[PDB]
Amino acid sequence: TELCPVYAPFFGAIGCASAIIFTSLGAAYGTAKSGVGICATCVLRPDLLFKNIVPVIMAGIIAIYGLVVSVLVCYSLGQKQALYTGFIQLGAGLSVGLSGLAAGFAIGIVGDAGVRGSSQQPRLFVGMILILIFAEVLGLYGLIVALLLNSRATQDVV
Amino acid sequence: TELCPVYAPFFGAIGCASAIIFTSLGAAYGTAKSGVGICATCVLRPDLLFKNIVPVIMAGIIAIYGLVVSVLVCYSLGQKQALYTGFIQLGAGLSVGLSGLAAGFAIGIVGDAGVRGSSQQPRLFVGMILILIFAEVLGLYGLIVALLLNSRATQDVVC
Amino acid sequence: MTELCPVYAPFFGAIGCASAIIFTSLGAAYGTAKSGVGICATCVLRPDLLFKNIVPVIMAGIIAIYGLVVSVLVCYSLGQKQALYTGFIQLGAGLSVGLSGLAAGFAIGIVGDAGVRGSSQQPRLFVGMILILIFAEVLGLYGLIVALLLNSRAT
Amino acid sequence: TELCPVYAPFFGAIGCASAIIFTSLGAAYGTAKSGVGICATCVLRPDLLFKNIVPVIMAGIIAIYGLVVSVLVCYSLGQKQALYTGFIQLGAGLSVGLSGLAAGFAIGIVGDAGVRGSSQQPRLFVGMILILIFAEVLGLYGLIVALLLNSRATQDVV
Amino acid sequence: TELCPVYAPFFGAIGCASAIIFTSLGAAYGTAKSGVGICATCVLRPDLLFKNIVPVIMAGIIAIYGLVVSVLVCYSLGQKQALYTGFIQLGAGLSVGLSGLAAGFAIGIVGDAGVRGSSQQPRLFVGMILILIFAEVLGLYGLIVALLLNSRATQDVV
Amino acid sequence: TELCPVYAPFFGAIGCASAIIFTSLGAAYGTAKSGVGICATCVLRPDLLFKNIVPVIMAGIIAIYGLVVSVLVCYSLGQKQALYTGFIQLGAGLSVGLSGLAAGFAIGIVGDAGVRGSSQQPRLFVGMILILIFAEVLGLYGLIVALLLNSRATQD
Amino acid sequence: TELCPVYAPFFGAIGCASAIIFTSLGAAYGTAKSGVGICATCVLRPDLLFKNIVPVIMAGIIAIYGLVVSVLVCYSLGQKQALYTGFIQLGAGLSVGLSGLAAGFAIGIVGDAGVRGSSQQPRLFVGMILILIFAEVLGLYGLIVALLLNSRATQDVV
Amino acid sequence: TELCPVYAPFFGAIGCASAIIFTSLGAAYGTAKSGVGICATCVLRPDLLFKNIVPVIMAGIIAIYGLVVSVLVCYSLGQKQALYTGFIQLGAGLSVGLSGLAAGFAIGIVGDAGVRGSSQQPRLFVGMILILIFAEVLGLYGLIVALLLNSRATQDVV
Amino acid sequence: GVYFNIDNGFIEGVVRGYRNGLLSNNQYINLTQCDTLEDLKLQLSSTDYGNFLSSVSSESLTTSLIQEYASSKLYHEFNYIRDQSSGSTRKFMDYITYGYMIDNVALMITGTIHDRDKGEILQRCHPLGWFDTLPTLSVATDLESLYETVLVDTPLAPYNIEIIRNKLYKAYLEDFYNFVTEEIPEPAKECMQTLLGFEADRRSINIALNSLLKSDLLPNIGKLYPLATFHLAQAQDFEGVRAALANVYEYRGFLHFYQLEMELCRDAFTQQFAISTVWAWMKSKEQEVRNITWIAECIAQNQRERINNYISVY
Amino acid sequence: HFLYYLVLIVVIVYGLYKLFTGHGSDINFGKFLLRTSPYMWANLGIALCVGLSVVGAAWGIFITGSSMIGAGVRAPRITTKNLISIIFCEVVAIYGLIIAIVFSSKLTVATAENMYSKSNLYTGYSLFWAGITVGASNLICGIAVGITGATAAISDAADSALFVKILVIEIFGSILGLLGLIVGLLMAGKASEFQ
Amino acid sequence: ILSSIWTEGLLMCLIVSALLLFILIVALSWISNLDITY
Amino acid sequence: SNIYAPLYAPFFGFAGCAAAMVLSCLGAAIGTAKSGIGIAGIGTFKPELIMKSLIPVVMSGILAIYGLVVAVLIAGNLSPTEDYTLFNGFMHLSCGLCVGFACLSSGYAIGMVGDVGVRKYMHQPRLFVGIVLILIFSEVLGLYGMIVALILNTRG
Amino acid sequence: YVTGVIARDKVATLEQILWRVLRGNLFFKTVEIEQPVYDVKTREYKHKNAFIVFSHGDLIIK
């Protein structure tokens, strides 16, 4: 059947793979880059430790956007699925993936940016976290399109 | 059929994918680059912080352009769509994304320089905002292309 | 469909519309980013030249407007069943304002960055700056002329 | 058979191999840069080796993750397996492989940063583990979708 | 037949060759890098000559990890192989090789720094080889899946 | 035919040529990096030159590791050989060549450090030589899976 | 035909040309690399000439190693030759070519260094030529396998 | 036909063009490097009209090795020729061009670095041109093969 | 050289416009005939200095004042070009200042080891090499202490007082030698290997000339690294270094260092798509701010015999 | 850089795969050049004519313009005396514009039949390679006039000793551009319109 | 017929989208230069 | 009609006069621009030596006329209305490769001679006949490619 | 204990030099100054910050 070929679950299998590959690779560049900056400045001030690991948390919120996609695209993979519902699966995986990669590239650089200059001025923290909210939302924009593409796997897939 | 092949939603799925990939890549470059120019400064003058968040809120807006098209180039997707529609959805998502990315680079590079040069003069913001506006229009040119281009999709289409 | 109008024929048109605005906006971005880093380094200490020195980013933005016009003009001539003749003149208009508006946007960026750093150490360079700058601008307009001339042969 | 072809256990075997290779390339980069930061700092502290092997031990755990998925992808191969089974296996092995590679890059970058500072101050590595734990958790999101994919492969593949 | 074609041996031959080549490349990096620092170590203290031999021989078991796999892949090669046992043959040994390549990268990069500072502390007889015993089982993880694949290679072919 | 096509000696020919070329690319880098450290250090101790050819000799013996299999894969090429025995003949050649090439690189990198160091302590010669032997049994590991693999070749 | 096709002399022509091309590139890296070192010396070069030209005369021999086989392959090169003949005489030219290229890489980097110490000490010549013999028999191992491939290129061809 | 196709003069045209492109890339490399080297420090003692032009006129002997074979394979070209003729004059264009590329490569390196030392003592002229004709015989070895391959592009070709 | 004018076009065009402000050999003949500093100021304003003493008085115009206003006018031009450079040139102009801050940490230690004031000593210090820790130089006089305490955060961190000076300076000049062969393109490769080597030469000759082991404190990047380093290492007298310096054809008869520098500098402007121009301008304008100072010392006190020792190749 | 040596292995393997299995005549560049539309080649020669001309014209402009703006910081009279160096960088784009206008007039719609005929394939190849000839020759002459007009800017810092010799080699780069123009006007000289 | 998978329309769509990717990747390289060197 | 004259044959003839013109003017540009770099570092201010220092740029403009004659001579054999074989399409492609890379070689070689050489036969007028005789051998690489072009034009 | 004020841009380098010079284990306290004042050398209104250090050693204090 030309609507549901046999190579159609390929794009879904690398739609659910690449939804955490690029996500946890952006959240790895989110946690490693922010982590070097936080660890280096933590030896000067020990008490400001739990207040400075917020880029690592907001890196893990990216990494759970990739998993909440990778489970929902995992629940519509079948041997006899349509080609179209491998395509929007692939589209969803790359949408939450490369946007969570951009949103981990953003909070890695502003992670060690904001965590290194906070030790010299304790007032630069409400401006840090609004930039981290701005950078974090981009990943959620990719999670919105990855949840609207995955709603469309059911609507008359024939 | 001939006009509507099974591989036609591939170009729409990577049109709505690349519409928010390349805008979030430009919005991330405009957010991260401006942000590191935020925290590089504001250690000698920390009370000037809600008037250099303009490149960061500006960069976020570019992301919205991608989300508007990628929620609007996704309402025209379908299993049986014409290849012309998929070519439009590809051209719309690439036109908003690769111009969104250009806008992001434009307000990434312009943004850190303005924030860091504003520490020595507070009156740089008057033309700094205007430069950011001109750099921002490119993203909206890619949106006003991909909205005229998206309006042609499913307009006198035949499948 | 038929031999004259296949199904891949509006790929050239769609790519052309996208190319016209993505390549001009990449060149206008490079022009804005190098001119804006020349301005925001120039007017740290000379803030009274802030309206003369902004003409490289206005002039680099005109490349974006030229790119926008080509995209709108050839999206008006797109269609599902279009001939493959008009597909490649929309791709010729696409990448002829495209790869010419990016090189013209680059050259506005390098000349405008050299100019706004040069027309502040000596203000007599401001007349010499823009006449070089116009030359690097109308190369994008020469790309635009080809596109208009080549889009005039659609149907 | 058109639905389960002859070349179907290629990316079931490449999918089994990929998990081990990618996972151990990250579990190598995780123990590489973490191991070079300990022995280059034990020249002034004789007890430096104690408690500085947490980054290396956690990196080692990621290798176990790629092994526990490689021994389950290996027990679902067959000469006549579905092409959908092969795609799922490839997706699962690349899912935990390229994400354990990222979770090994993240440990290898937070593994030398906290070795030049822990010698200067011993009362700081209670936050180092917490920042690092996220990287380990990031790898765990590789098998927590890979495991789902492996179970999915077994059921109703005709 | 189509299940047992004529080009099936080539995948198996590549698997057998790959196990020997990739592992040796990893071992050669684990030997050359580890013993490149002997001049600095012995121009000051010649007593540590019998400590550089440990990361060299730990890569020597890495090299016979691939030599056991490549002489067990070679016993299952044949002219009239199935195509399935070609892919597992390629997979068995692709994994031992490229994971012994990562284990030889890790051993030869942490045995360098472990011996570059060993002259300043005689109490690093355990802490260096404790890092080595995690970096050397990264290749054993490749071997114990190359032998589970090789156990499945000719088990139920037809 | 089908099992023995006409393009089958391309595989064997590539294997016979690759084994000699790859191994002597590694024996070149082995005599290269060692001999560039040998002749730059004998100006201070001209009497100890004969105990610095031992990095060069090992590389020269992996070049005959490559030759003793490339003379033995040439013995059974044939106009009409099976495709199996073209596949493993590149298998054998690649196995002795790319492993041997790595072995050469290991000897060369390790050897250069040893020759330069050898001017300070005569007890270092027994330590450096032993490490090199380990990095040359990697070449003989490639030769075991070159010879054993080659031996089966002509069974069917 | 099917054993002797029309593209069969393409492999032989490339093979015959390759021996000359590849061997010359080695003899030119042997000549040019060794040559600069000899030219640089001037205070002892006219006193100690005809002992610094032994790298460039040993390197030159590699070129005639490729000439004596490229003339020997060009005699068996024909229009209706078998494809086996073109295969194992492309294998002859590639073996003598890339091993003469290796033996020119050795003599080029070995020979220039030797001259430097030959200017400082006249008792380096016997240590230079012994290494530079093992670097030239390396080209002869490619020759005594190229002429052995060429000894059976027209043995029992059809 | 089968022995003499329509695209058969493609390989002949490529070979003829190839000799000039490679031979003149190497003759320009010889001329470009030698001229700069000859005039770097010899501004004093203005009695050096014909001091060192012998690498330049010998890279022109290189370029006429390309011209002789190029005219002679241009005589063998024809509209109805065999693949065998096109193949062995592709090999007769490749050998001259590539071999004399290496020949002018050797001439350039020797000339550029060996003319600086001459300025202090004019006794370098004896040993320069002795090691500088070994580089030129690499091109004459390339022409011998081409001129001997060219002597077989008509002997029993049908 | 088609990619040079992207980031370095305005840079080279203005540096090549500063070397036309290098006042020529006719511009000193009319400048050596003043006999008062006011008159010199009067006809130094006609040059491309361009009335830089327009704010100082004429009654109180010190000899040093002209030495530091002309050098301030040099240094504002240097960090005017320096903060307009890309990542392959901003680093190169920082590596120019890295050899300046070695002469500043060499003078802060030998000024703070003795009884002296921080402010007075700081005034003499060269201001292109100036990091934020440099005004301290008083935590300890120990050489070991300085590296951990104060030089750890500097860019001198990968690198008795003159012993650690040459220990810093040789590792600096080695690191500056293999940077300019790595990231800087072809027309400035041959420049920044030969001009830089010269700097390694006339520093290594001053090692043996100031020493009358020594093999580790001598830089080895130049033409004296392979051969003349061993001969210059075991030279204990002036004739040993005089015999060792005769082996080089470009240094024979010299043992005249700045004249050979300026003649090697005038050929550096003969290239015109290279970044060796900014080093040639820096060492040329630093030459002609000690030529003007050498003239103004012969004008402030009347020493008319030894005036014509200024050296200008440009 | 590694992807160059990965798509070269694929071309070798797929070449020997077609060649060894007797189907090496499937990789035919002739049938590619004969089934491909001539409007592709003709308008990827027009758009890449004015494209690569402008790319070289702008490449010359930011070389000598950013040189003589830097050289005009001290001598500001150069930017109104050495603007002849940015004329000939921009006449490069004029020469790629004239070719576009002339070429366009040969670009008409063809019928369904008489579409892949001899003359239509001729003028497709002709406007393709002539637009590459005048597009890339003007790319090189724009780069050449830029890098020799930038040495006219830092040598007009010196008063009059060299500009009369520098101009001669300034217009020698213009002559090359003109000779490239009259080759593309003769490559497509006999090319007809699409009929 | 050129072929059945690599048809001449797919090839002419894949060449004008590889040329536009070539002049995209080089233009992104030029823009990337600003980030790398500023 | 002809098997030997297919309709795609002018693709390789226009690729010939393209490669004969773009490459030749590439080499011409390198020679003129690169030697004009060397001219721009000199001072003469006298007659009869201006016309002597312009030898490499009037020698580099001949390389563009070498490409001009070949490109105008193999575009005079191209017309849409007569027999054009594949054979002379391959020869005109090889004429364009010969002249294009030979004038590219001559332009690289006279640009690398003439950038330092013009600074040697100026303000040292005693080695002028050596630098020009270098430039004659450095020019005639393109005249070699023009001779083999003019043989291939009258041969196909 | 010693305390005073600096020019508010040296806090990052006074903490940096005081972290390295006593032990790596010392007390520190920082406070800002509102309404900054001008000076004589800089001739501009520069910010200031109050700093407090603490030590028990006599030679360390000097």
Swiss-Prot record, chain C:
It comes from the Eukaryota. One of its GO terms (molecular function) is proton-transporting ATPase activity, rotational mechanism. GO terms for biological process: endocytosis; endosomal lumen acidification; Golgi lumen acidification; intracellular copper ion homeostasis; intracellular iron ion homeostasis; protein targeting to vacuole; proton transmembrane transport; vacuolar acidification. Keywords: Hydrogen ion transport, Ion transport, Membrane, Transmembrane, Transmembrane helix, Transport, Vacuole. Residues 1-8, 75-90 are vacuolar. GO terms for cellular component: fungal-type vacuole membrane; Golgi membrane; membrane; proton-transporting V-type ATPase complex; vacuolar proton-transporting V-type ATPase complex; vacuolar proton-transporting V-type ATPase, V0 domain. It is found in: Vacuole membrane. Residues 32-53, 113-124 are cytoplasmic. Signal peptide: none annotated. Disulfide bonds: none annotated. The record marks E137 as: Essential for proton translocation. The chain crosses the membrane at residues 9-31, 54-74, 91-112, 125-150. It is a multi-pass membrane protein. V-ATPase is a heteromultimeric enzyme composed of a peripheral catalytic V1 complex (components A to H) attached to an integral membrane V0 proton pore complex (components: a, c, c', c'', d, e, f and VOA1). The decameric c-ring forms the proton-conducting pore, and is composed of eight proteolipid subunits c, one subunit c' and one subunit c''. Present with 8450 molecules/cell in log phase SD medium. This is V-type proton ATPase subunit c. It comes from Saccharomyces cerevisiae (strain ATCC 204508 / S288c).
Swiss-Prot record, chain J:
Pfam families: ATP-synt_C. The chain crosses the membrane at residues 1-17, 44-64, 83-103, 127-147, 166-186. GO terms for molecular function: P-type proton-exporting transporter activity; proton-transporting ATPase activity, rotational mechanism. One of its GO terms (biological process) is endosomal lumen acidification. Residues 65-82, 148-165 are vacuolar. Keywords: Hydrogen ion transport, Ion transport, Membrane, Transmembrane, Transmembrane helix, Transport, Vacuole. The keyword Zinc does not apply. It is a multi-pass membrane protein. The record marks E90 as: Essential for proton translocation. It is found in: Vacuole membrane. It comes from the Eukaryota. Its main location: membrane. Residues 18-43, 104-126, 187-195 are cytoplasmic. Proton-conducting pore forming subunit of the V0 complex of vacuolar(H+)-ATPase (V-ATPase), a multisubunit enzyme composed of a peripheral complex (V1) that hydrolyzes ATP and a membrane integral complex (V0) that translocates protons. V-ATPase is responsible for acidifying and maintaining the pH of intracellular compartments. V-ATPase is a heteromultimeric enzyme composed of a peripheral catalytic V1 complex (components A to H) attached to an integral membrane V0 proton pore complex (components: a, c, c', c'', d, e, f and VOA1). The decameric c-ring forms the proton-conducting pore, and is composed of eight proteolipid subunits c, one subunit c' and one subunit c''. Belongs to the V-ATPase proteolipid subunit family. This is V-type proton ATPase subunit c''. The lineage of its organism: Eukaryota, Fungi, Dikarya, Ascomycota, Saccharomycotina.
UniProtKB/Swiss-Prot annotation, chain L:
Gene3D superfamilies: lithium bound rotor ring of v- atpase. Present with 538 molecules/cell in log phase SD medium. Changing E139D: Partial inactivation. Keywords: Hydrogen ion transport, Ion transport, Membrane, Transmembrane, Transmembrane helix, Transport, Vacuole. Residues 75-92, 153-156 are vacuolar. V-ATPase is a heteromultimeric enzyme composed of a peripheral catalytic V1 complex (components A to H) attached to an integral membrane V0 proton pore complex (components: a, c, c', c'', d, e, f and VOA1). The decameric c-ring forms the proton-conducting pore, and is composed of eight proteolipid subunits c, one subunit c' and one subunit c''. It is found in: Vacuole membrane. GO terms for biological process: endosomal lumen acidification; Golgi lumen acidification; proton transmembrane transport; vacuolar acidification. GO terms for molecular function: proton-transporting ATPase activity, rotational mechanism. The record marks E139 as: Essential for proton translocation. Residues 32-53, 115-126 are cytoplasmic. This is V-type proton ATPase subunit c'.
UniProtKB/Swiss-Prot annotation, chain M:
V-ATPase is a heteromultimeric enzyme composed of a peripheral catalytic V1 complex (components A to H) attached to an integral membrane V0 proton pore complex (components: a, c, c', c'', d, e, f and VOA1). Subunit of the V0 complex of vacuolar(H+)-ATPase (V-ATPase), a multisubunit enzyme composed of a peripheral complex (V1) that hydrolyzes ATP and a membrane integral complex (V0) that translocates protons. V-ATPase is responsible for acidifying and maintaining the pH of intracellular compartments. Is present only in vacuolar V-ATPase complexes; enzymes containing this subunit have a 4-fold higher ratio of proton transport to ATP hydrolysis than complexes containing the Golgi/endosomal isoform and undergo reversible dissociation of V1 and V0 in response to glucose depletion. The lineage of its organism: Eukaryota, Fungi, Dikarya, Ascomycota, Saccharomycotina. Present with 55714 molecules/cell in log phase SD medium. Glycosylated. This is V-type proton ATPase subunit a, vacuolar isoform. Belongs to the V-ATPase 116 kDa subunit family. It is found in: Vacuole membrane.
